[PDB]
Structure 1
C-alpha cells in the first residue's frame, strides 16, 4: 500500500479522485513538493494524450484554462500532472451552501466564459463542456477561487478561416449537454464554435438553479434538446435578475446555432454587470437619446412594447416622495420608457441637492438607487439592452456590447 514514483511525480494509488475514459484514473499526488492531480493513461490512449498535451504546450496560457505541470512515462503507462483543484463544478454545485457565497457562483461562470473565449480565439472548439470537467481551484492568499476548463479529449483545432467542422468525426460529446446540431436527423449546416455556447448555456442554468438542467431530468435531456423542449422554471419572469439571466440563457441554448451569442458577446451581457455598471448603462442611454426625435428609429424602437415595461403609467408605480419631487419643474409621459429613463438620469445627476425624504426613498448611489427602479420595473434593463443594440457600434456603448 506504498507510494508509486515515476520521475518527479509521486502518488499513492489509494488517493483516487475519480475514474473515466475506460482505464484512465485520476489520483491525487505530488510533483516538485506541490499538491497535484495525476491522470494515468493506458497505451491505447498514448496517441490522443500526446495530441492534447502538444495542443496545450503550444497554445497561449490563460488563468481559466487548466495548465499541466509535467508529463511522465514508464514502460507501461503515461502520466499527466496538473494543479490540484478543490472540486469539479459539479461537486461544487451539489455540495456548497450557496447562501454564504454571494456572487462567487456568477464569477465562476464569468471565468468559464473567459476561458472559452480564449480557446475560441485560438481556433479551438472544446465540444465537451460540462460541470464535471470545469475545475474549481484551491483558494489563493485572499481566499478567492477560479474556474478552469479541462478535458480536451474531444476538442478540435480548426484551420484558419474555417468556420466549422464535420459532425461525423469523433464522439458527439456527453449526453444531456450536446448541441442539437450534433445529433439531429435533418441538419444542413455543420457544427461550429456555438456548440460550446449551447453547452455553456446549460451550465449557466445548472449553476444558478443549483442542479437543474434546461432540458429536464437526465433520461429526458437529449431527447428534449432535439425537440427544443427547454424549461427555465427557476427564473421568475418578474424578478429583474431572473429576467436578465433568462434573456442570456435562452439565447445561448437556442435551437438555431446562428442565434447563439459568441463567448465575447456573453462576456458583455448585463448578466455580469455590477449594480453601478447597470446604472451607468441607464445614464448613457438617457444621454444618447435626449436629443433624438421621438419619430427617429432609436426612440421608436425603444418605445415598442414599452407600455408593459413601464406598467402603463410608471408614475403610479414609484413611491410618493419621488412622485412629489418629479412635479417640481417639468412633466413626464407615464407610458414612455424614454421618460422613465429621463427621470432616473435627473435624480441621479441632481442627487446631492435632492430633498432628504427623496434621497431616503431612493437609497444611496449607486447600488440602492439603481435597484429602486429595477425592482419596480424588472423588464426595464432587459428591454433597454435589446432596444439599444442599434447603437452597439458607437464608441460610447463599447463597455456594454461586443462589436467589430
Structure 2
C-alpha cells in the first residue's frame, strides 16, 4: 500500500497497462469508499513514460467534463510522476466488446452521444486526443445501457493544435490511426473522427473496417487504395450507414467535420 497525497493504492491491483504507463486501483486514505485509478510510470520505458505522464497532467488539468476521466490529483517531481484519476467501475470498451461481441444500434447511439459531448469540449479548447480506441474508452455504472456513462481516457499523446496549423507527429494506435497519420502526412482534428468511425464500426460489426495483418500492411493498403469504402451490413439503419460512410473517408478534406458529426441525425434522442 503506497501513498500519493491523500490517496493510496497497491501494485497488486493492476487494472491496465501500456508501453508508457501502468494503472492501479486505489482509494482515498480517509474516505475508503472513494475509489481511484493511479497511473504510474512504466519502468521498461522510463524516460518516455515520464514525459507522457507529464503531458497528460498539463492537458487533463484543463478538461472538466462528465465524459472525460477526471484528474483528482497528481504529483510530479524530477524523478517520479503519478496521476490520481477517477475510477470507472465498468472497465474499458475493449473488454466490453470482447464479451458482448457487438452492440445494438441503440447502445452505440448512447455511447456515441457521450463521446461526441467530450469531443465538443476538446474541439472548443483546440485539443486533439490522437489515441482514441476502445482500450481508452471507459465505462461507469451509476443497470441498463441507458445508464452507462462513458468517458474518454489516456491523454498522453494529446496536444493543442491551433486552428490554422497541422500536426505531424506519428503517434497513436495503427489500427485506429487515420490514413494521413499512418502515412506520415500532416493532419488535424479530423484524424480523431476517423478513429471514432473505426470504434463505431467495430461496435456494430465486431470487426475492423479495413482488415490488415500488420501496421505496415495497413499503411500499404491505404497508400494503394485512393478510395476507402467500408462494407456496411444490410441490417444497418440508414442514419448509421451514412455516419459511418462520412467518418471513414480516406482523405481528411473530404471527411465529415466536427459540426456535421455533432449534428448528425444518428445522434438525435
For residue 263 of structure 2, the aligned residue among 253, 259, 268 is 268
Counterpart for residue 7 of structure 1: 5
Please show how residues 156-167 of structure 1 align to structure 2 within 5 Å.
Answer: 156-159=159-162, 162-167=163-168
Partner of 1:191, secondary structure, is coil
Q: Structure 1 residues 115 and 172, CA, compared in 2 at 3 Å: closer, same or farther?
A: same
Counterpart for residue 78 of structure 1: 81
Q: Deviations over 1:194-246 (max 9, x none)?
A: 1011111111101111x21111145354433333575643521xx5x433222
Equivalenced residues, count? 257
Residue 50 of structure 1 deviates from its aligned partner by: 2.8
For residue 149 of structure 2, the aligned residue among 131, 146, 150 is 146
* Higher Rg: 1
Distance 1:242 1:203 in 2: 17
Partner of 2:172, secondary structure, is coil
Please show how residues 3-82 of structure 1 align to structure 2 within 5 Å.
Answer: 3-22=1-20, 24-31=21-28, 32-33=31-32, 34-41=34-41, 44=47, 45-57=49-61, 59-72=62-75, 77-82=80-85
Q: Which has the higher contact order (CA 8 A, sep 6+)?
A: 2
- Asked whether the 8 Å contact 2:59–2:159 carries over to 1, the reply is no
Q: Structure 1 residues 228 and 218, CA, compared in 2 at 3 Å: closer, same or farther?
A: farther
Please show how residues 107-118 of structure 1 align to structure 2 within 5 Å.
Answer: 107-118=110-121
Residue 251 of structure 1 deviates from its aligned partner by: 1.3
Residue 193 of structure 1 deviates from its aligned partner by: 1.0
Q: Structure 1 residues 191 and 102, CA, compared in 2 at 3 Å: closer, same or farther?
A: closer
Distance 2:180 2:78 in 1: 42
Please show how residues 272-283 of structure 1 align to structure 2 within 5 Å.
Answer: 272-274=267-269
- Asked whether the 8 Å contact 1:105–1:207 carries over to 2, the reply is yes
- Asked whether the 8 Å contact 2:52–2:157 carries over to 1, the reply is no
Q: Structure 1 residues 83 and 228, CA, compared in 2 at 3 Å: closer, same or farther?
A: farther
Is residue 202 of structure 1 aligned with residue 203 of structure 2?
no
Q: Deviations over 1:158-200 (max 9, x none)?
A: 23xx333231xx3332111111112337x5xx31111011111
Counterpart for residue 99 of structure 2: 95
More strand by share: 2
Q: Structure 1 residues 28 and 8, CA, compared in 2 at 3 Å: closer, same or farther?
A: same
Counterpart for residue 245 of structure 2: 250
Residue 115 of structure 1 deviates from its aligned partner by: 0.8
Residue 141 of structure 1 deviates from its aligned partner by: 8.8
More helix by share: 1
Mark the runs of 5 or more structure 2 residues left unpaired by the alignment: none
Partner of 1:103, secondary structure, is helix
- Asked whether the 8 Å contact 2:22–2:40 carries over to 1, the reply is yes
Distance 1:228 1:14 in 2: 48
Q: Deviations over 1:244-302 (max 9, x none)?
A: 2221111112122122222332122122235xxxxxxxxxxxxxxxxxxxxxxxxxxxx
For residue 188 of structure 2, the aligned residue among 172, 189, 192 is 192
Q: Deviations over 1:3-36 (max 9, x none)?
A: 22233221121111121134x2111111243111
Distance 1:130 1:35 in 2: 24
Counterpart for residue 209 of structure 2: 214
TM-score by length of 1: 0.58
Mark the runs of 5 or more structure 1 residues left unpaired by the alignment: 275-404
- Asked whether the 8 Å contact 1:117–1:264 carries over to 2, the reply is no
Q: Structure 1 residues 97 and 192, CA, compared in 2 at 3 Å: closer, same or farther?
A: closer
